């Protein structure tokens, strides 16, 4: 996670993408419906 190649696929339209971006799901706190989460930065952006 957080570096080049964090998401890979055999082709653009392949259906077997595999990635590891360090997704973390958090416990909701506010009353209204929500899906709080956090993630590593885009490794592609970092490499660029």
């Amino acid at each position: 996670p957080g570096a080049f190649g964090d998401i890979q696929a055999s082709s653009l339209y392949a259906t077997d993408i595999v990635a590891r971006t360090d997704i973390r799901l958090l416990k909701p706190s506010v009353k209204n419906i929500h899906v709080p989460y956090t993630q590593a930065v885009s490794g592609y952006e970092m490499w660029k």
Binding site: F4, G5, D6, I7, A9, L12, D16, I17, V18, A19, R20, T21, I23, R24, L25, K27, P28, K31, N32, I33, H34, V35, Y37, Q39, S42, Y44, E45
Partner: protein, 98 residues
């Protein structure tokens, strides 16, 4: 560059939700104990504490990746090919050879 996808949450009023394996990239799922969530219009479930919410988040390809994308390559031994302008007498020739 990836584009995170967070599907609409699923909630059960008085029950239990269980994670299920999926083949999507970096599919991450969790189940939370008591929520009692709200929307525009007030509460959505009747149970005061037995409310269960399930969160999913996987990763897909960004819509603009068809142009801004990178390809990884493994390169073996390089082969060399040249073009020549061999001349002799009053005749000139052009040819390519490896």
């Amino acid at each position: 560059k990836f584009h995170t996808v967070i599907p609409s949450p699923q909630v059960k009023c008085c029950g239990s939700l269980e994670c299920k394996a999926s083949s999507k990239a970096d599919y991450t799922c969790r189940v939370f104990g008591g929520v009692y969530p709200f929307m525009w219009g007030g509460a959505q479930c009747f149970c005061d504490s037995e409310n269960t919410q399930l969160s999913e988040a996987y990763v897909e390809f960004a819509p603009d990746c068809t142009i801004d994308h990178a390809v990884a390559l493994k390169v073996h031994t390089a082969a060399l090919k040249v073009g020549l302008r061999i001349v002799y007498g009053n005749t000139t020739a052009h040819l390519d050879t490896f």
